[PDB]
Symmetry: C3
Subunit: 430 residues, 3 copies
């Protein structure tokens, strides 16, 4: 038949959807009883197991991935050899990614989906800053910093005085700064650093096969993961509603971002109608919402932005190819919204500095996740394990990533499309 | 004289035998008193010391050795470029190594030598499986996983519920799987992995000199080690008997393996007389029991297996050279028997999953220990420290490795000799 | 003006002196009140902070620096290809560095500056020796060994019996031996080690830019460091006196070393007047006390030692260039005196084995600190963190390193100058 073509080509996505349709079914069948058929937590602790094995594979693969990939991505950057006219594009990409992430965490905090049913002082900024630059780069790979208070009982009966120590679970946040500074150092070293860069970049592809094989294992892990998850909550008529509120929340966040904020930076700078520009460029968005692929939509988008509202004719070949892989605004929006939704689902007591380190770490990792096909879930697990949040809920987000991803794709092309529709004045207005 | 020739050539073995003949003597002289001449444990804790220093050198050298050597030994394997006719030879080598190790642990458990004078449930398989794929590859280098039980006191007064944490002492077992998957990944990456393979293989010879120098230090360490060991037991008329029972046990295990099990796989597949084949190939076994060297006996063995019972004339040049360094059945037999003998000598309470991880880890490390001349003791220390067993008793095994090694050599050539006498039917019977 | 020339060229030293002149001033202004304006320890724990951030950067940079630099400095050494006539120069350099360090710790212990206002037995040598060769090279990067005593209560009521465990804070001392043996192993491996040496040496320059940038950050860190330090002591009329006693102590140690000990090894071997030799070579010392630079003073010194007291005419081109970067006697003197002064200032209870590991570790690191311009403070922080001493007091030593460094420079040229004035007899007297 023709079934062999559509089987082997798109196999892993069919495997994970046929795994998750049973994972909801098996968890439904054992959730018909109240979490205990014959062994309540005992057989459950082994019934939940291969999803936990999948997370065990994911943590040991997200250590070397982030350190070697950010070394290879911070040695590659050459701001001197990229043009000041191109540098303002990077500035715009960074500020709109920060803006998208900020508004997304703001709206997800405002609606607070999922929540429907350690006293640390303001001086956690010192703990976060000490966690940025760690004590040594081996204890930084498995344990981060944390200050607990004791009582010296001086000047009265009690005094809340902080002692400082290192608690378990790594700091990716404190490691990405060292790897980025290492890549910048390898650039500034120059020709002696060629061997180290050819080492570390080759180390990255020596782990892309590893995450490829973990992706091959991923269906049975995600099936057992979501099965143990829905037998844990014991509320299907509410978890459906929590997931739907989260989905609607992040899609309307995508909508209000792409419909007001990029229009805000348009009209605040160009003072021309953004709606006429978008009405000019409807059809590559009509294929981005068709295919959901930022790679294949790029030639039609580059051809369209030159015809309607004629751009500077070279940045369409310069900033628009490179902007598709660096300004993924909707993906950063999705990751910052979804991680706050898990914390509001598990009641993890968000400090404001936890909001800052879920902002900036997921912001800098927006430029990644492009070589990895399912990098949106991988980077989400990265920023979950950077704040010691439960990665256990990632199956539910990966259960419904398609329905929101169809809308997430168009933000990532709308951003750099409007950036192409913005910097044409900087040779005119200057 | 002629003494300078036989001194410098074979020097280290003369050094360790003249060290161990004094180590039994000094421990005898201080064991004439009951473990306390003038300071019982106090001066003893410094009298025992340089053997513990030798073990301190051995652990810090067996970390990088196993990770870099298994990377260099899992990048080298090419099953696609080795032939399906050659692949069944690898299958046979693996199954006879597993069979030899299984029967050896079975018989050493059955006789239980040395023993003459933490309640963990069946769910340790999850602990072992989580210990296979670790959380991160830096905490995997010094500490493994272990689940302890506490009491939530829910549904009654007490409930044995497992919490999970990471206890000290590394998991080589959890590290060899990552290094092997890394080498396979470097193969599947191809030409970008050339720099990483030339890194990691060069790292191996950057530690073979290290174990050469630790071997140079080894005589005084093993002398003080066995001296502190025999003053610890305070029973020489029994420890002699325990060692003799162990020696007789492993040599008869070698005997029953090479006399029935390889005949079993012969007669079950060929249905021809194995004794006539062995009577044909007596004389290379007569030199293997002469010289005790698998390298030098290989040309005579390859010439002999073609004359008597004429083999397929090319696999003798293909599977018989490579089988001498990969199918070391008797060495794996020795390591799995000797490690169980130490645990039965120290009462280390063997779980069945400890039997599984002393089976399979020592099975996969049978292919090693060939470039290292005294690799039989090194791999034994590896599989002892992979299960947190006391490495302290390794002097007694290295005291008598010669007497059993004379018989251990002939198993390693008898195995692939009978494998050459087996796969000739697969072009005839097919 | 001409101010732009003297600004950009010597900028960092002007930055750190204008930072330290305010750091004494701000700490003076807040020390006018008794350590508490409105928040005693609470705002102080954040007021002290960026100096602690500077130390946080320094520890994570002194791990990879010492391991890669000593690999690159132990692979470079070739005693076979350096001449036995040149090897006695290395022997003399090592013994005069050990002698200078020994006399410096002796005199600094004898005067005991700064002190004006854990019972471990003699068996710490076993703890130090186990700390030399660690258990594994990942736990050796963040935690060292330490034996605590408990009571088995056997043979009486109590018995002080040592248990052994690993306590936090790395052992550089146990790591430098592994890196040095690794570099020697890479030499003895030869042409397969070329890739590893070109890796590790390139890794060194990939951290010299890192310590360059930490040096750029260093002024505000040292200002806040000394400001929090002088508000801690609350005694300026004594800390001035403690610092002056320390300065006078180390400068007179330099004086008595260069005026008696190198004359002692002169007259004990040559039996000629050392004062006539020094009166011959006054003027390169007059420029070394002028410029304070061992690099630029070397041609004038090499020309001067040949004219007055005519040396062997080739070792002046052989041992005198290489001796300027390996025999830094005064720097090792300074580091061993200053570290004992901190321990006598903080009452850190010096064991004799702590004197041994502050002797030998700082002795072997005298050959370093030459490529780093402010390597005298960096190596001081290294040998402070090798013995878990407080690095917190390093601002006061770096506050006054100039006043003693002016005298420290002449020892480093006086040593190898007198060594050139010594080995000329070994072709004459032989």
């Amino acid at each position: 038949d023709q079934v062999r073509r559509c089987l082997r080509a798109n196999l892993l996505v069919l495997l994970t959807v046929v795994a998750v349709v049973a994972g909801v079914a098996l968890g439904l069948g054992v959730s018909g009883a109240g979490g205990a058929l014959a062994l309540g937590p005992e057989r459950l602790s082994a019934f939940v197991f291969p999803g936990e094995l999948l997370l065990r594979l994911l943590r040991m693969i997200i250590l070397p991935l982030v350190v070697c990939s950010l070394i290879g991505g911070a040695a590659s950057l050459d701001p001197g050899a990229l043009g000041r006219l191109g540098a303002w594009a990077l500035l715009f990409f960074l500020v709109t990614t920060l803006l998208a992430s900020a508004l997304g965490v703001g709206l997800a905090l405002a609606l607070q989906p999922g929540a429907a049913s350690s006293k640390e002082v303001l001086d956690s900024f010192l703990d976060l800053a000490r966690n940025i630059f760690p004590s040594n780069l081996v204890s930084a790979a498995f344990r981060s910093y944390s200050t607990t208070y004791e009582e010296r009982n001086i000047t009265g009966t009690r005094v809340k005085v902080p002692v400082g120590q290192e608690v378990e679970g790594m700091n990716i946040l404190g490691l990405v700064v060292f790897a980025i500074v290492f890549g910048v150092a390898l650039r500034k070293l120059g020709p002696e650093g060629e061997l180290l860069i050819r080492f570390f970049n080759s180390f990255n592809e020596a782990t892309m096969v590893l995450v490829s094989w973990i992706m091959w294992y991923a269906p049975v892990g995600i099936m057992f993961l979501v099965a143990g998850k829905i037998v844990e909550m014991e509320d299907v008529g509410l978890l459906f509603a929590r997931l739907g509120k989260y989905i609607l929340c992040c899609l309307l966040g995508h909508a209000i971002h792409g419909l007001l904020v990029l229009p805000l930076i348009y009209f605040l700078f160009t003072r021309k109608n953004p709606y006429r520009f978008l009405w000019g460029i409807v059809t590559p968005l009509a294929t981005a919402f068709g295919t959901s692929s930022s790679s294949a939509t790029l030639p039609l988008m580059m051809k369209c932005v030159e015809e309607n509202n004629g751009v500077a004719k070279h940045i369409s070949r310069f900033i628009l190819p490179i902007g598709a892989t660096v300004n993924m605004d909707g993906a950063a929006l999705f990751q910052c919204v979804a991680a706050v939704f898990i914390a509001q689902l598990s009641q993890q007591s968000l400090d404001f500095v936890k909001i800052i380190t879920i902002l900036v770490t997921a912001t800098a990792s927006s430029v990644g996740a492009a070589g990895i096909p399912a990098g949106g879930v991988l980077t989400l697990a990265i920023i979950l394990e950077a704040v010691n949040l439960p990665v256990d809920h990632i199956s539910l987000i990966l259960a419904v990533d398609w329905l929101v991803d169809r809308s997430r794709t168009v933000l990532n092309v709308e951003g750099d499309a409007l950036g192409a529709g913005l910097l044409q004045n900087y040779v005119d207005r200057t």
